């Protein structure tokens, strides 16, 4: 009926970093908060130990998204999937131009939010 230690979530972490007594009375509820790169998408950010001795929870976080970085002068900013954490955008230059810098950038953890890994390249000539 009782739980062992909770499973680790890829999207959130426990709020108290307490002793984590390896055993928990049935009915215990543990509070979580979103990891960097994630934002809350549900009202209940808990894990609860049910009568079967198992931890129950929803995926209560989703990816943060980066702001669109704007236009590339004489080139193109291409979205491949979206601007969410982990996603990549691609850069190219128009016919009469050379691309100097990176052809890609990725939404990554930055500060306490999310930002682009690489600066926009330049299209020159």
């Amino acid at each position: 009926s009782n739980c062992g230690p909770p499973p680790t979530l890829s999207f959130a972490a426990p709020m108290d970093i307490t002793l984590t007594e390896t055993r928990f009375k049935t009915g215990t509820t543990l509070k979580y908060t979103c990891l960097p790169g994630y934002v809350r998408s549900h009202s209940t950010q808990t894990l609860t130990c049910n009568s079967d001795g198992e931890w129950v929870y929803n995926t209560f976080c989703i990816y943060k998204r980066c702001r669109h970085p704007g236009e590339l002068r004489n080139g193109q900013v291409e979205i491949k999937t979206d601007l969410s954490f982990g996603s990549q955008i691609e850069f190219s230059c128009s016919e009469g131009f050379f691309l100097i810098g990176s052809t890609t950038s990725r939404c990554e953890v930055q500060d306490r939010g999310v930002g682009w890994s690489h600066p926009l390249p330049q299209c020159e000539i």
Binding site: R40, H42, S43, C66
Partner: protein, 34 residues
Amino acid sequence: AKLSEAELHDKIAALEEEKAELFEKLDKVEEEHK
């Protein structure tokens, strides 16, 4: 009279952060009222 410039994407992000803010408001109200 201007088509949303695919900044559909920025709007989706803002809407999701605003939901998250609502969720915080919801349990912060629900905590101290209990």
